[PDB]
Ligand SMILES: O=P(O)(O)OC[C@H]1O[C@H](O)[C@@H](O)[C@@H](O)[C@@H]1O
């Protein structure tokens with residue numbers, strides 16, 4: 255098996271190339287062996303709506319059963335529905351076969367063993383088990399479980415909308431269309447569907463709400479139908495993107511402000527996690543409401559671990575993964591998050607544009623990406639962490655280097671999904687944004703004067 259598919263947060267490859275049916279079998283065998291080693295024979299399995307789903311899921315399931323595992327096959331479901339299954343069924347282990355927001359031929363595995371989402375050395379440990387033949391052998395079993403209705407009811411029974419809303423829902427032809435439009439209607443909304451037929455060819459736009467290009471159809475429909483809100487889901491339903499009644503894109507760090515207010519109001523002193531890419535305004539906002547702001551590393555699996563370590567009631571990433579523990583289970587779930595957003599907005603007499611515009615705003619950049627190499631990206635960060643001078647500011651090195659200045663901040667870190675450096679800048683003036691950019695530009699050039707600086 256190729257080493258490149260074993261990534262920091264999960265497993266991901268290209269079907270036909272780096273991820274075959276046989277690889278899926280052996281990955282199943284490794285996960286089943288690790289689950290058993292943690293005392294957990296029961297493993298839930300789900301898949302998204304990708305073309306390669308049926309082929310690879312059978313092999314994944316067989317690998318697990320060949321360890322002696324008891325598999326609960328939940329069929330085709332959103333990622334969070336698989337996480338849900340691993341919280342409410344007998345077993346605390348689960349595997350989701352998904353390639354997330356990537357092009358059609360990509361697939362992969364997001365893995366929970368005995369309650370914990372695997373990352374880093376734990377993901378490599380699976381690859382290492384296969385190489386070593388450190389694998390369990392036994393005769394397992396498979397039971398079909400129809401879990402979607404239970405999930406649907408769980409959310410419906412706990413969300414209380416105070417008024418009706420009209421909402422455009424763009425599924426991007428991903429697996430969210432199996433439930434999101436139906437659930438949102440059941441909450442007391444009317445839903446205008448966009449690309450909600452599940453189709454793994456992704457013939458309209460990629461289900462990647464983090465790019466504004468993939469929200470253009472949603473924004474136009476919101477305006478044309480005079481809708482109260484627009485929602486877009488990524489391919490496997492663990493990410494959500496939001497647009498207001500006037501078409502304004504609400505970035506996830508700003509969504510989190512609304513959610514942090516909600517959660518902290520019922521839970522004084524609650525820990526609230528956000529990643530290094532999120533606005534500093536969120537930090538002040540959480541503290542002002544009496545919560546404890548906890549900045550952490552990018553990556554769904556890393557955020558979920560940090561939530562267990564801190565007891566945080568809510569987490570969010572700039573990528574749109576939002577993780578409710580309060581009233582919920584602590585996993586990232588775009589569908590549940592949409593429902594929580596609708597609950598809050600429905601209790602407000604103002605429109606969604608005005609609810610979000612009331613929070614402070616700064617001037618910010620879109621995520622910047624510089625392509626380096628897979629085998630040099632971490633070394634560039636290490637050199638910055640060793641050598642760099644940032645001027646006066648609060649320096650955080652938990653993920654790359656983030657520096658928080660009086661009037662703004664900057665970040666440079668290595669991506670764990672691509673061979674790139676990722677940067678973000680925010681400040682309260684254009685002048686300050688340029689000052690911080692110049693600091694980072696000069697520090698990168700000090701490490702490697704040939705490095706591109708396309709900001
Ligand atoms: O910045 P990175 O490391 O490339 O990851 C960015 C995003 O990738 C995926 O969408 C997920 O794993 C998210 O959890 C993460 O926020």
Ligand SMILES: [Zn+2]
Nearest residue numbers: 354488490492
């Ligand atoms: Zn996703």
